[PDB]
């Protein structure tokens, strides 16, 4: 049992990636934002407040013959976004790329934040962190990957995000076709329930590599690269005009400037993010200030390797008891 589904950016900035998943019987196709930094499968639904759904496709549990109320079961999630979602919960058959899982917990939103309502391309989330994080009460649920694991050929999914382009999520196998050279695997701490790992240093452009341990999370659900104040300061110091703004709330640079690449260390390996991935374009329409894709971790308390870093690598989340994280060049 394997599964491969195409993931597609929702905008030309690649703010997020959406993958079609099939829920219910017969199937309802929803486009979900695969989030390795949460643990809840949540969807817009027939129960979602009608003043909170704006062109999103809803899951109607009443048309699924596989769908069943988990009586008493309840969810509430809160992101670092400040994003919120909550409601009640169903079990149902869920298929990703032809990999089918029955009795998946499908948490139906009665309530959703502004941030989600505004985002017409996202029909909900598929959380791919560790199940410890999952929110449902009073009985806590498992994640789709955890539900599939035993069925899979290998208990593993890979992430292959595209820059301005589709890519792929594969389940159950490693497409040796899709990367260059060798995969470097590195230790994962599950202790906070994140794909949490420790990077071995960094280089800015064609500079010297600094060996320094940077602890943070692989998160396909976060757009930007979030690194300590020290490292982020070194990066922008290399771009004439870049400064941290109070107003806009992070580093900006003159759109006419030239972003140096950013190198991160995975073991004795190195992954270069091209300076082009670091461009998030004009902070406002018309503006000649442009938003940087590397920002300070100082106010989140965790360093996040978000889509800007992951899109530059072929990433394996080995979910094997001793979980590991692999990086390859692509």
């Amino acid at each position: 049992s394997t599964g491969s589904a195409t993931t597609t950016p929702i905008d030309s900035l690649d703010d997020a990636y959406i993958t079609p998943v099939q829920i219910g019987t017969p199937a309802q196709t929803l486009n979900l934002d695969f989030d390795t930094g949460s643990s809840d499968l949540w969807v817009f639904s027939s129960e979602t407040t009608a003043s909170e759904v704006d062109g999103q496709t809803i899951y109607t549990p009443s048309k699924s013959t596989t769908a069943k109320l988990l009586s008493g079961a309840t969810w509430s999630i809160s992101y670092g976004d400040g994003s919120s979602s909550s409601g009640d919960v169903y079990t149902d058959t869920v298929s990703v790329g032809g990999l089918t899982v029955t009795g998946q917990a499908v948490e139906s939103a009665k309530k959703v934040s502004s941030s989600f309502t505004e985002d017409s391309t996202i029909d909900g989330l598929l959380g791919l962190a560790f199940s410890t994080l999952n929110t449902v009460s009073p009985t806590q649920q498992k994640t789709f990957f955890d539900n599939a694991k035993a069925s899979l050929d290998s208990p593993v999914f890979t992430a292959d995000l595209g820059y301005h382009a589709p890519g792929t999520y594969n389940f159950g196998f490693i497409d040796t076709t899709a990367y260059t050279g060798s995969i470097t695997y590195t230790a994962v701490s599950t202790k906070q329930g994140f794909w949490e790992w420790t990077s071995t240093g960094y280089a800015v452009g064609s500079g010297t590599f600094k060996s320094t341990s940077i602890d943070g999370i692989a998160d396909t659900g976060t757009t930007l690269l979030y690194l300590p104040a020290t490292v982020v300061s070194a990066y922008w110091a290399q771009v004439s005009g870049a400064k941290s703004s109070s107003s806009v709330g992070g580093y900006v640079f003159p759109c006419s400037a030239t972003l140096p690449s950013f190198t991160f260390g995975v073991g004795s390996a190195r992954i270069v993010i091209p300076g082009d991935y670091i461009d998030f374009g004009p902070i406002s329409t018309g503006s000649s200030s442009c938003f940087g894709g590397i920002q300070s971790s100082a106010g989140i308390g965790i360093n996040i390797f978000g889509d800007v870093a992951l899109k530059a690598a072929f990433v394996v989340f080995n979910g094997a008891t001793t979980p590991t994280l692999g990086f390859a060049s692509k």
Binding site: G37, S78, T222, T223, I304
Partner: peptide
Amino acid sequence: HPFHXL
């Protein structure tokens, strides 16, 4: 229009 998912 960035996203930061916990």
